[PDB]
Symmetry: none
């Protein structure tokens, strides 16, 4: 059964305090058909889908997709690794980025 | 016990022509385990899940969830009533909203 | 085959001077598969697709589609009447709107 | 006996993964009467027809035509070379551009 994964659990998608999104991802199992739910104050953050190179360098200049609702539901349709980060200046560097492994 | 319901059938989720989404919902039977499929031009529409109050007043300010893929597959995993509307300015008022009764 | 119709011909999509877009449309024959090309300075205009009611009242508050490139190519894929207007305040009232009858 | 060429085949027009559009173009033959089909998520990409100069420098400021349907069917009724690129910031630089030689 498809499952909705709330990014950061009760903490959500934020930069208010440090939060290890890599550990959040590791504590979850993502399957095709699942979705990610990003909850945040859209006056301070957004969600951008990028590739591995942009993810590692925190490059938010050329996103493959962008979400700005504050309650974005993003589908995980195929097996592989997906990368998301907040594009607001300096946020990715603060650790607001997450790698999602779908059905490895 | 496992059916995919195409919202608006072949017409999809749109405002180009008047479409009775209420009649579409009433012409279908939704059961837990089923899913909804919203097909639309995602540059011009979106799908927001909201509560009863927001649904009636067409308020798209604080949605519970926002879908923007243009082919959203939304699973119905619990009995009850669910509300969806398009948050693009004025689309909800034109009738692009739908109430789903599950189980 | 298909044909590209340049809206307003050499005059384009503008409000600089009065231009009868209805006459332009009547002098053209639109077929399924054809496209419309709107050329304009996008700092002053845009192109919105609306329904008949909104078209008649120059209501640009809830468009079905929006284009803002200044060189928009819009496909005409089905038989029927389509309506377009510029949504910048007062432009539709100046006559910057056009009804397209496809086949 | 016209032929519809689906740009990027099943992969379509995207930047999600590196895709060699140049190889795609080279592995296909385009003749007058054919058409190109660009399939993509139109909220995140577009198709702009530009000149050789703009193509090389990935300049999308003054396109000859802008397509945004997500399933653009573009007829090729003249021999020669045509240039297309995605105007979304940085996409052209990532390689989302294609040169088409007809006849
Ligand atoms: Cu942020
Ligand atoms: Cu809508
Ligand atoms: Cu105007
Ligand atoms: Cu693009």
């Amino acid at each position: 059964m498809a499952t909705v994964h709330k990014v950061g659990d009760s903490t959500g998608w934020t930069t208010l305090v440090p939060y290890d999104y890599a550990k959040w991802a590791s504590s979850n199992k993502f399957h095709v058909g699942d979705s990610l739910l990003f909850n945040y104050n859209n006056k301070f953050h957004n969600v951008l889908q990028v590739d591995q190179e942009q993810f590692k360098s925190c490059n938010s200049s050329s996103p493959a997709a962008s979400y700005t609702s504050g309650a974005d539901s993003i589908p995980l349709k195929r097996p592989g690794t997906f990368y998301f980060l907040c594009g607001i200046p300096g946020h990715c560097q603060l650790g607001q980025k997450v790698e999602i492994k779908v059905d490895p």
